[PDB]
Amino acid sequence: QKLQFVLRFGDFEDVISLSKLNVNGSKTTLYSFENRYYLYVDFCNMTDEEVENQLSILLEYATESSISIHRLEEYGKLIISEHALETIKKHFAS
Amino acid sequence: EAGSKVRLRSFTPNLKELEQKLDEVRKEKDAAVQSQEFEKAASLRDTEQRLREQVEDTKKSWKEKQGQEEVTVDDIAMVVSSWTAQTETDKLLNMENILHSRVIGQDEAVVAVAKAVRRARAGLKDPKRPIGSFIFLGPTGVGKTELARALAESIFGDEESMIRIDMSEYMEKHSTS
């Protein structure tokens, strides 16, 4: 089972919102593309049950884009690497 | 019109005839290779190719022409010279000088018209009304029509942009123009 996902937020504030929680063993990176912001999540070692779980939460705040992840790595616009969530929490939650 | 008319005017030197030369060389080259006659041609290839890189450096020398066309009114209004300022108001200030060179005697008339056109043409008269409404009184062959021409020429550009009706034709209750 796959352990890396790419999600699209409709408006940026949706992302801040997601930040205000717990990333947890989750490397994550955030792109800007077609005006909408995509976010790329990477779970290192977790049980499938453990990941189908966690991903649930994420999609209260996003949807899962069919987008080839490498399209981003090439033609995207990087905004935050590896610790993408973590950073927005700093400059935005209060 | 101009949203092309400029990339148009852009891709309009005497560097045509080399193309013509060039042409037959290749041709001359072909014929001999199927006759072979290689050298007697390879000559001719080494020779077509001298002319190749030749013309290029005046076609790649035509990104020298991209530069010269940039956006400002320069390009826009020349567009218009078709669809319809110093020596345009100078036609006006100096109208009398101008009408005088065509209409002889008749200074009484010229100055009256000059000033009237210049009034209307300067913002004062109401725009929905003609530029000028005049009546020309006087004897025949004095300049009545002649001034109307000179006006057309000076004001409208063409001594011939002039409609002319003969009211002899409209004496009865059939007055439908």
Binding site: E34, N35, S65, S66, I67, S68, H70, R71, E74 | -
Partner: protein, 178 residues
């Protein structure tokens, strides 16, 4: 023959790098292919890594069908085939809204004009032509009740269509609107 990404432009000149590294005199479709897998980072490059086609496997087939090596290098030019292949990637991108060509499109453009040396490297490396256009595809993508029927085109939806932030100004006729 125009302007592409760095990645494109690099991969293309990179064909030439390979033009000579083997000594041949015209760069055909086989070199454009080496060009792609050898810049190793383009979407084109990435794909090949998928089918099981590193630079290792490929260049071995190619040298096994051409080899040295007239160092002639007398200022070389393309194959007419490959010139077609380039004319094609331009179109394999009109066909994608991609305003500019790049590593993928050139790989796309090769499959399309399959007659040629690249194509055979692969029909030789047991990689039919379509399994390949696929791999590139699966690395690019995109960007409702009764709307089903309506939503032909006929007749495009002013509303949600301009809900997507996607709308401009717009200057009126402001009291024309109301």
């Amino acid at each position: 023959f125009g302007r592409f990404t760095e990645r494109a432009q690099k991969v293309l000149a990179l064909a030439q790098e390979e033009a000579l590294r083997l000594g041949h005199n015209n760069i055909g479709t086989e070199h454009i292919l080496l060009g792609l897998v050898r810049e190793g980072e383009g979407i084109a490059a990435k794909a090949l890594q998928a089918l099981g086609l590193g630079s290792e496997k490929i260049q071995k087939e190619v040298e096994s069908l051409i080899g040295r090596g007239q160092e002639m290098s007398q200022t070389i030019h393309y194959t007419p085939r490959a010139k077609k292949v380039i004319e094609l990637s331009m179109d394999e991108a009109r066909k994608l809204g991609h305003s500019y060509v790049g590593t993928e499109h050139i790989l796309l453009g090769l499959i399309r004009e399959g007659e040629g040396v690249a194509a055979r490297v692969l029909n030789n490396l047991g990689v039919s032509l379509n399994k390949a256009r696929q791999q590139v595809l699966q690395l690019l993508g995109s960007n409702s009740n009764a709307n089903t029927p309506t939503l032909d085109s006929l007749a495009r939806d002013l509303t949600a269509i301009a809900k997507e932030d996607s709308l401009d100004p717009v200057i009126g006729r402001s009291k024309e609107i109301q």
